[PDB]
Symmetry: C2
Subunit: 94 residues, 2 copies
């Protein structure tokens, strides 16, 4: 009941913005779950920085004493969240 | 140097927002470039829905004639953008 030309530039931008909205709501929810567990913000930041493969932030947080064994709301750690083997080993190799 | 208690709730919130902004800004710009590259909107929508693993959207778009062999700016298709084997096979098995 629909053809290729029934989709235009506005349909692409609208889907982008809608999914962008759901992404902000979902990632905000994840943040509050972390803060609502009594995890120190510095360990929470490492969990995020690990997810993002953010090497400079990872190095900064470890130097300040971030603990990479702390478990999140899924029972998973910054090592689990590390988005690559190299990120995993940067964290382990500090 | 820095310490563990130098990081607070506001740091957690600011880091999520900073990373969320970078994500949005990168994907928004890539999306707009694809549009200006006169790739058909329905094919761009399949690329985005594949990235999202949005099964109802993918099925709607494929019924409408969306083409999963079209390549984006990185040479990649909706098949490549799929986040899992289940979504890959959903697209291929239509």
């Amino acid at each position: 009941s629909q053809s290729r030309d029934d989709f235009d530039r506005d349909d692409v931008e609208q889907y982008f913005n809608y999914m962008g909205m759901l992404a902000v709501e979902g990632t905000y929810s994840k943040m509050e779950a972390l803060l609502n567990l009594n995890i120190h913000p510095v360990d929470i930041l490492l969990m995020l920085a690990a997810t993002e493969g953010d090497r400079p932030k990872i190095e900064e947080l470890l130097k300040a004493g971030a603990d990479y064994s702390v478990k999140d709301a899924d029972g998973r750690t910054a090592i689990d969240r590390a988005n690559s083997e190299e990120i995993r080993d940067l964290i382990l190799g500090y």
